[PDB]
Amino acid sequence: KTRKESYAIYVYKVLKQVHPDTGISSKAMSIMNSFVNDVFERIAGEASRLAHYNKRSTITSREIQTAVRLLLPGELAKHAVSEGTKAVTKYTSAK
DNA sequence: TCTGGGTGGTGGCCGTTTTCGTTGTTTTTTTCTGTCTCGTGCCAGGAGACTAGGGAGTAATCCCCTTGGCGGTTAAAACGCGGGGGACA
Numbered sequence: 001k002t003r004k005e006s007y008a009i010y011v012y013k014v015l016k017q018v019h020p021d022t023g024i025s026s027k028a029m030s031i032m033n034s035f036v037n038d039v040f041e042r043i044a045g046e047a048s049r050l051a052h053y054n055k056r057s058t059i060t061s062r063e064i065q066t067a068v069r070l071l072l073p074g075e076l077a078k079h080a081v082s083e084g085t086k087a088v089t090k091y092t093s094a095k
Numbered sequence: 096t097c098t099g100g101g102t103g104g105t106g107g108c109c110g111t112t113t114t115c116g117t118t119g120t121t122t123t124t125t126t127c128t129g130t131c132t133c134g135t136g137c138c139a140g141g142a143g144a145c146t147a148g149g150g151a152g153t154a155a156t157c158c159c160c161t162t163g164g165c166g167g168t169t170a171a172a173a174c175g176c177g178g179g180g181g182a183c184a
Contacts, residue, residue, distance in 0.1 A: 003139085012132090023131065057150065 007036045043067045061088050 011032045015024055024032070046067035047059050056063075061084070068080050 026130070029131095 007033045011036065042071055046070055 008029050011029060012024065015022065043064060044059075044067075047063040050063045050066055051057065051059055065081055065084060068084065069077050071077075072080055
């Protein structure tokens with residue numbers, strides 16, 4: 001029985017974070033997983049293009065941030081950048 | 096006293112409002128069923144700790160080209176007049 005990976009459990013955790021008393025259906029979970037994969041691919045591809053354009057061989061958090069600012073619209077981009085910076089700072093704080 | 100004009104009342108026609116029944120749809124309570132969510136167990140991917148190397152950060156130098164400004168020419172933009180053909184009712 002093949003072991004197929006998905007974002008189902010993390011999407012569920014985020015859902016219980018925002019709407020504690022609310023479930024999700026299998027079809028909706030599949031749509032959410034597809035959405036996460038699509039956004040991942042878009043941001044990662046834009047970051048790869050950014051690194052290539054600058055003759056840089058590494059994808060850093062700066063490349064991800066610029067990719068996010070390019071892809072997402074105004075307010076969504078602002079808040080995504082805020083969350084990303086928060087997470088990166090919290091990560092570097094701990095070891 | 097008669098005729099014309101204007102106002103007031105009555106009647107007729109038209110428009111609006113309501114007024115009503117009829118379907119269609121929404122809401123509510125009961126049923127029941129199958130997928131969502133939780134648990135168990137295993138495993139394999141992530142973590143930890145460590146070494147090696149070079150990608151990239153950083154400083155210094157330089158040489159391009161981006162900015163600024165200035166004057167002369169004149170091509171283009173503006174403003175106006177006029178008319179007719181196109182929008183639209």
